[PDB]
Amino acid sequence: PQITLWKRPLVTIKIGGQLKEALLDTGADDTVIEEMSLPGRWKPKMIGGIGGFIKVRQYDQIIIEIAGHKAIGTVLVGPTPVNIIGRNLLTQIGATLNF
Amino acid sequence: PQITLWKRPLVTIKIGGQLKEALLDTGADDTVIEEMSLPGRWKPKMIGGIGGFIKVRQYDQIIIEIAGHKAIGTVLVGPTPVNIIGRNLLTQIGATLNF
Numbered sequence: 001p002q003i004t005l006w007k008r009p010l011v012t013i014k015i016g017g018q019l020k021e022a023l024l025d026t027g028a029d030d031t032v033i034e035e036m037s038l039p040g041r042w043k044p045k046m047i048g049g050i051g052g053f054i055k056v057r058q059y060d061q062i063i064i065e066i067a068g069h070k071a072i073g074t075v076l077v078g079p080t081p082v083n084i085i086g087r088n089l090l091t092q093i094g095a096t097l098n099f
Numbered sequence: 100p101q102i103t104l105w106k107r108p109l110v111t112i113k114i115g116g117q118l119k120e121a122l123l124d125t126g127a128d129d130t131v132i133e134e135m136s137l138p139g140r141w142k143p144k145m146i147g148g149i150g151g152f153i154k155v156r157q158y159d160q161i162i163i164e165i166a167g168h169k170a171i172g173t174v175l176v177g178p179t180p181v182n183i184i185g186r187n188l189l190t191q192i193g194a195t196l197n198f
């Protein structure tokens with residue numbers, strides 16, 4: 001698709017068999033999802049946003065569908081105002097910004 | 100142009116007579132620039148993200164040249180760690196996300 005930006009670019013994702021809403025966020029290096037259960041081991045990561053740096057859980061090689069496109073990559077889990085799909089997965093679905 | 104997302108989508112902007120680097124950010128409702136003076140009236144605002152909230156000054160009707168494309172709108176000024184071009188100005192330059 002071609003998504004204009006008059007409204008938030010919210011899409012449906014599927015992770016762990018569950019549908020969730022997420023924001024397609026070119027200003028995010030990383031994908032961050034609200035508290036949920038994911039399989040496997042995690043590692044620590046500090047990420048910095050508008051209000052400062054926080055701790056999140058990094059899960060690698062997680063299967064996630066984004067607006068119907070399959071991705072397999074790193075998902076960070078922690079407190080966020082909205083689930084955000086960052087560039088690590090936007091590149092896997094072939095997204096670009098155009099003007 | 101078509102901007103890929105392998106790297107942060109940074110562009111040059113001109114605002115208040117000054118050249119700055121800023122992130123094209125589809126996950127940002129609003130445009131947020133590091134501390135600088137702008138002319139005209141302003142009012143305080145709180146905006147929030149990962150890490151929490153920051154206080155900013157809201158200036159309306161500010162012209163900003165973004166990668167060579169002029170656009171006018173509200174600009175928030177405050178202690179952001181990165182200059183952010185949000186959707187309020189991305190729409191005006193015709194930016195879309197494509198995949």
Ligand SMILES: COc1ccc(S(=O)(=O)N(CC(C)C)C[C@@H](O)[C@H](Cc2ccccc2)NC(=O)O[C@@H]2C[C@@H]3NC(=O)O[C@@H]3C2)cc1
Nearest residue numbers: 027028029030047048049050126127128129146147148149
């Ligand atoms: C109302 O207007 C606003 C309100 C909030 C924000 S924001 O900066 O908090 N933000 C909103 C989302 C969190 C919904 C825009 C983001 O694109 C933000 C933009 C941003 C802000 C500050 C520093 C870097 C990037 N990136 C971000 O938080 O990324 C997370 C935090 C880590 N940084 C990063 O690149 O990847 C990690 C994930 C911007 C304008």
Ligand SMILES: [Cl-]
Nearest residue numbers: 171172173187
């Ligand atoms: Cl505006």
Ligand SMILES: [Cl-]
Nearest residue numbers: 004005190193
């Ligand atoms: Cl349009």
Ligand code: NA
Nearest residue numbers: 040059060061
């Ligand atoms: Na894993």
Ligand code: NA
Nearest residue numbers: 139140159160
């Ligand atoms: Na003004």
